[PDB]
Design a protein around this ligand. Structure first.
Ligand SMILES: [Ca+2]
Ligand SMILES: [Ca+2]
Ligand SMILES: [Ca+2]
Ligand SMILES: [Ca+2]
Ligand code: NA
Length: 483
């Protein structure tokens, strides 16, 4: 059956500590609609209870220890997470854990460090004389102690930080020391994009490298994870991420599917990342997200024939996790690039009913986002579920593309022996609707198909030659399947 991923959280998921319970309770629903894997938010202790997990303090504290004024993380306790994972597994749904290895936040104390300021637009360029600062680099894990790992962090395990406690100033501080330099083989943006935020981990440090692989194996085992989602990959030494994934797979003997969040709308750079990680992990199809967002926001002027241009799914579908939206692109966020509501179901049809790519459904799109703007994403589960049904039960067999009009594009799937009634004919348009004749397969001759989305109430009779004339409304989507 087709695989479908679901990012199970949004930026405004509440800090009520009930998210793991929500996931456990949603297990049956997710399995029924076709979700086969869930990407959960960072499960370890952040700098505070309210942190979304991208400001990780202790990777070995899965909401288990008394650290940062809380036992549970924003999402819940370790046991509640394990219960959720157990429920998902009982329903044949896999779980991918978020991996945040770029930096550490919320150090226990500062340490005297000799550093130098670097140009934010070119981190290879020092901009000040070297001086002593008080950097938050001492991570001792007072609540966990040596449970699971006795590794303690110090300034020399980091390449830099952005805050000096002595002068109370923010700058991009690069640490001085034997062998200290920004990690190489990271995005070349800003000269060297190794530094992003908080205390930057030094992946040139052998102990850090070894300890992080040990943690990865521990993490996978502790939660019975089936895979990973790697955070801020373009800011982490590529060869390290390559080796880290390899180490976990070698130790667990499991596939451990991994998708990296390499955030750059550039197929060439994404290709480079794949090469530098020996194609051992997928990447989110950032270009496709931007193409979909462009189509949704250009008032019908976007040339739909170019929707696959420069996308990862077009070149390496085997390494592409296609998506419409995520917590960083949703309204008000750091990478804001929201696919407009009217086009959203069309975008989902594009990633869910086509043969290429591993598609991902966004929690915020299914259940809405709880931000405070006047443009929050509404709950679109009623529009998305019929499309998920199309993917689960009908998106099989030979595909025929008709991405041949600047507004109205479509494709068909003939269906195959995996499901006797599989097959579909999809049409989407970023402007006026209309009809398009498409070959749906001679094997479907004489059948009557209907629009599973319910947007149109008319049926289509497949001709004796396997062709049908399919219709779609203005700025809409229609997916015809056998009655
Ligand atoms: Ca380094
Ligand atoms: Ca880094
Ligand atoms: Ca158009
Ligand atoms: Ca059929
Ligand atoms: Na680094």
């Amino acid at each position: 059956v087709n695989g479908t991923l679901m990012q199970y959280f949004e930026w405004y998921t509440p800090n009520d500590g009930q998210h793991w319970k929500r996931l456990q309770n949603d297990a049956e629903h997710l399995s029924d609609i076709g979700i086969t894997a869930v990407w959960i938010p960072p499960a370890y202790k952040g700098l505070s209870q309210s942190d979304n997990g991208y400001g990780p303090y202790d990777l070995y504290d899965l909401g288990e220890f008394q650290q940062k004024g809380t036992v549970r993380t924003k999402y819940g306790t370790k046991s509640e997470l394990q219960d959720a994972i157990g429920s998902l597994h009982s329903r044949n749904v896999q779980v991918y854990g978020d991996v945040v290895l770029n930096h550490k936040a919320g150090a226990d104390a500062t340490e005297d460090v000799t550093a130098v300021e670097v140009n934010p637009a070119n981190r290879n360029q020092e901009t000040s004389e070297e001086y002593q600062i008080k950097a938050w680099t001492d991570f001792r894990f007072p609540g966990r102690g040596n449970t699971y790992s006795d590794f303690k962090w110090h300034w020399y395990h980091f390449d830099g930080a952005d805050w000096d406690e002595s002068r109370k100033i923010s700058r991009i501080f690069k640490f001085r020391g034997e062998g200290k330099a920004w990690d190489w083989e990271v995005s070349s943006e800003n000269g060297n994009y190794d530094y992003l935020m908080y205390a930057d981990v030094d992946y040139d440090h052998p102990d850090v490298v070894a300890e992080t692989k040990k943690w990865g194996i521990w993490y996978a085992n502790e939660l019975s994870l089936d895979g990973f989602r790697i955070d801020a990959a373009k800011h982490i030494k590529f060869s390290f991420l390559r080796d880290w994934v390899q180490a976990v797979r070698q130790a667990t003997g499991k596939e451990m599917f991994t998708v990296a969040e390499y955030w750059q709308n550039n197929a060439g750079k994404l290709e480079n990342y794949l090469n530098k990680t020996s194609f051992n992990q997928s990447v989110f199809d950032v270009p496709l997200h931007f193409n979909l967002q462009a189509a949704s926001s250009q008032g019908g002027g976007y040339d739909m024939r170019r929707l696959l241009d420069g996308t990862v799914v077009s070149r390496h579908p085997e390494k592409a996790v296609t998506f419409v939206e995520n917590h960083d692109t949703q309204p008000g966020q750091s990478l804001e690039s929201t696919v407009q509501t009217w086009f959203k179901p069309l975008a989902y049809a594009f990633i869910l009913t086509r043969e290429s790519g591993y598609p991902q459904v966004f929690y915020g799109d299914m259940y809405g986002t709880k931000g405070t703007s006047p443009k929050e994403i509404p709950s679109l589960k009623d529009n998305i579920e019929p499309i998920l049904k199309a993917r689960k039960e009908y998106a099989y067999g030979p595909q025929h593309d008709y991405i041949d009009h600047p507004d109205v594009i479509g494709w068909t799937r003939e269906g195959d022996s995996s499901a006797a009634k599989s097959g579909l004919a999809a049409l989407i348009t970023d402007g006026p609707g209309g009809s398009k004749r498409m070959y749906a397969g001679l094997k479907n001759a004489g059948e009557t198909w209907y629009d599973i989305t319910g947007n149109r109430s008319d049926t289509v009779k497949i001709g004796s030659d396997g062709w049908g004339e399919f219709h779609v409304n203005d700025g809409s989507v229609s997916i015809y399947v056998q009655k």
